[PDB]
């Protein structure tokens, strides 16, 4: 069993070029998570010597 908690920061900046249109889209982002990681693993083997 496991419980992932992935967080994050960000910082972005974009400008679009047009004829009479201009604008700067400067950004920053953050997104956490509350996960649940679980697994059931089976195995057989056969060691002949």
């Amino acid at each position: 069993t496991s419980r992932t908690h992935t967080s994050e920061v960000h910082g972005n900046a974009e400008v679009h070029a047009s004829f009479f249109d201009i604008g700067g889209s400067v950004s920053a982002g953050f997104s956490n998570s509350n996960s649940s990681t679980v697994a059931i693993d089976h195995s057989l083997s056969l060691a002949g010597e």
Partner: protein, 49 residues
Amino acid sequence: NVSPEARHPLVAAYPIVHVDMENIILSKNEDQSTQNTDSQTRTISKNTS
């Protein structure tokens, strides 16, 4: 064989014996062993998740 010096009633006839060592062969009582061993294996497994 009584030597002719001692063939007079006044001279005694008798042996003088002694032992002398000429070699000494000492031999260390000790045992060895050797060994040679092979081995082969096959492992066939399974794993789901």
